[PDB]
């Protein structure tokens, strides 16, 4: 579960752990993973022009800071069968920092 962290640290975590597959900007393209602009408050599997797995659409999670933290702890345990091949951020502070950044950077 989420507590406010450091967006500055979260930016560095994004650059090293997520940027490979994702962009955050309004104008950012889908890559291996979908662009994440507007992710919070949208249901999973809803970015236009991206081909999601059945598993991601089926989860139908309304993304918020708390379920994002559970997801990022271990994506495959939260959405078994997702094609996001990322083992997770096991340190709670890392998830808090990353999500603090993501809440701002995807607006
Ligand atoms: O809201 S934010 O959480 O993002 C946030 C923004 C700013 C800010 O001061 C703070 C928190 S408070 C703060 C938090 C943390 S910590 O919690 O992350 O440890 C460490 C520090 C720190 O002062 S020290 C520090 C570390 C680094 S770094 O090591 O190179 O990243 C760069 C700068 C810097 O001062 S310079 C620097 C560069 C930029 S930028 O836009 O050019 O990236 C913006 C700012 C800068 O100060 S404003
Ligand atoms: C490539 C090796 C990736 C890494 C590194 C990261 N993500 Fe990812 N992500 C990737 C794919 C292929 C997908 C689609 C999964 C599917 O099953 O269809 C995703 C999906 C997400 C989502 C959900 C998006 C949505 O429902 O619209 C989120 C919120 C997400 N990814 C976040 C995220 C974070 C925060 C990352 C760094 C910790 C990260 N991803 C890395 C591919 C890859
Ligand atoms: Zn400062």
Author numbering: -4 to -1, 1 to 103
Please give the exact wording used by the authors of the publication that reports this structure.
Here, we describe the tsclx4-/Zn-directed assembly of two proteins: cationic α-helical cytochrome c (cyt c) and neutral β-propeller Ralstonia solanacearum lectin (RSL). Sulfonato-thiacalixarene (tsclx4) provides possibilities for protein surface recognition (e.g., lysine encapsulation) while simultaneously supporting a metal site that can bind to other features on the protein. Whereas sulfonato-calixarene (sclx4) consists of phenol monomers linked by methylene bridges, tsclx4 is bridged by sulfur atoms that enable metal coordination. The metal-binding capacity of t-butyl-thiacalixarene has been explored extensively. In each of the model systems, incorporation of the macrocycle–metal complexes contributed to protein assembly and crystal packing.
Co-crystal Form II was obtained at 10 mM zinc acetate and diffracted to 1.3 Å resolution. The structure was solved in space group P212121 with an asymmetric unit comprising one protein chain and one tsclx4. Similar to Form I, tsclx4 was bound to Lys4 and supported a tetranuclear zinc cluster. The fifth zinc ion was also present, but in this case, three phosphate ions were bound. A sixth zinc ion formed coordinate bonds with two of the phosphates and two water molecules. At 1.3 Å resolution, the tsclx4/Zn/phosphate clusters were clear in the electron density map, corroborating the Form I model built at 2.4 Å. Water molecules coordinate each metal ion in the tetranuclear zinc cluster, fulfilling an octahedral coordination sphere. Similar to Form I, a second cyt c was bound to the zinc cluster via His33 and the C-terminal Glu103. In this case, only the side chain of Glu103 coordinated the tetranuclear cluster. In Form 2, with one tsclx4/Zn complex per molecule of cyt c, the packing is denser (solvent content circa 40%) and the largest protein–protein interface is 350 Å2.
